[PDB]
Symmetry: C2
């Protein structure tokens, strides 16, 4: 019922696949009374958190984008990583992405895509499951015993045809990934794709996963070597900043 709580619920009705809503539809999805929903949306429009387009629909505001991103930890990490990720992207010509753990899910901070690339379900400011993605497996492999036990104790849905949902197999995959310095996950998210992930370290701690998404049929090792090179470059720049 507090204004802040209602404002967060309005923001939560938007998503990766939902850019434009009527203020009525916002009220329904946010469980606000119609009268209240228009008042909250109108106030949020006036301060620029939301915008009305020329089509009259409500969208996340440029002003919100600006205030949320400027000087943010997400932007600072993205700026250090991006030059190296572009060099990966030049060579592999599929997808290059950067992910962190956020409340036991994968959150993507960056995604570069080539024009006719394989399908890719990772979205900037979107999520995928920890157990099912190369990014998640690499991050979970470097998380604490507590976090490993916590994620592996929850119901693990099948995402793609290759998803491993057995806790015992997952522990062994995490062990392999820990030793190898990479994990490939053929078809764990989609039938068409392999995700390949390496760790990004800062002050001896894994803070992110750098990955490629490429066709499942493509060679893994050449992409592993490109990702490892890029990772060293990012770790060098993190040290220097």
């Amino acid at each position: 019922d507090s204004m802040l709580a209602r404002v967060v619920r309005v923001l939560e009705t938007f998503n990766v696949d939902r850019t434009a809503q009527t203020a009525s539809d916002i009220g329904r999805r946010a469980a606000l009374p119609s009268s209240t929903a228009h008042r909250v949306v109108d106030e949020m429009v006036l301060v620029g958190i939301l915008e009305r387009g020329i089509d009259g629909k409500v969208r996340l505001g440029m002003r919100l984008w600006e205030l949320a991103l400027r000087g943010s930890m997400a932007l600072r990490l993205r700026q250090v990583a991006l030059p190296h990720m572009e060099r990966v992207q030049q060579r592999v010509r599929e997808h290059t992405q950067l992910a962190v753990l956020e409340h036991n899910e994968v959150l993507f901070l960056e995604r570069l895509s080539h024009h006719e690339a394989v399908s890719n379900l990772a979205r900037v400011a979107g999520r995928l499951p920890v157990h099912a993605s190369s990014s998640g497996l690499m991050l979970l492999a470097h998380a604490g015993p507590e976090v490993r036990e916590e994620v592996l104790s929850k119901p693990l849905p099948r995402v793609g045809p290759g998803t491993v949902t057995d806790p015992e197999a997952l522990r062994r995959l995490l062990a392999n990934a820990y030793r190898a310095g990479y994990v490939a996950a053929p078809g764990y998210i989609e039938a068409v794709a392999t995700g390949i992930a390496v760790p990004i370290r800062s002050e001896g701690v894994v803070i992110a996963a750098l990955s490629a998404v490429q066709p499942l049929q493509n060679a893994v090792e050449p992409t592993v070597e490109i990702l490892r090179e890029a990772a060293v470059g990012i770790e060098t720049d993190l040290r220097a900043s």
Copy 2:
């Protein structure tokens, strides 16, 4: 004075070169009383809009970043533009950036920079004046007379040694820009640099400026041709 206005005033204390603050820093910068400042910040931390780190300092939250960007027009336009911008970067090797008008200033959605390139004052999620930037002039040229005369009514400070601050000169620069499909601004922001901007259309409306920043002494026309080609590709993809 409302909670929402106070929340936005707290968010406005952060900036392109200010990541971490104390709640007392925030209260001072947002002109909030101490008791109010501490209460609004704590509530913003509780819902994850801000995060309180190990060191006790307050930062913009990962949850705010996620809610602000996902499916956003800023992110969607940047994702369509980026491969075309990267290809401009490969050919020009200076700066390639993407901008929109935001309440009588230029807001940069993206900037790609080559190592050791000319000085560039454009920052991602940062701003520059409309009248003084190639991006601002190209956007104002397409924003209609009402918005245009609104901008030309406000102060027009000198930024760079080449800044044009006369309304009538600016009207004529905008008309030239409109017909040319590009504007170059030699020394309008800094003595070392020329900004070069072209428009990006979506559904027949200019929605953004694609621009290069390069040394002032460099050839303008080759960069214009590369920027025009990139804009056509972005517009093709937007269709």
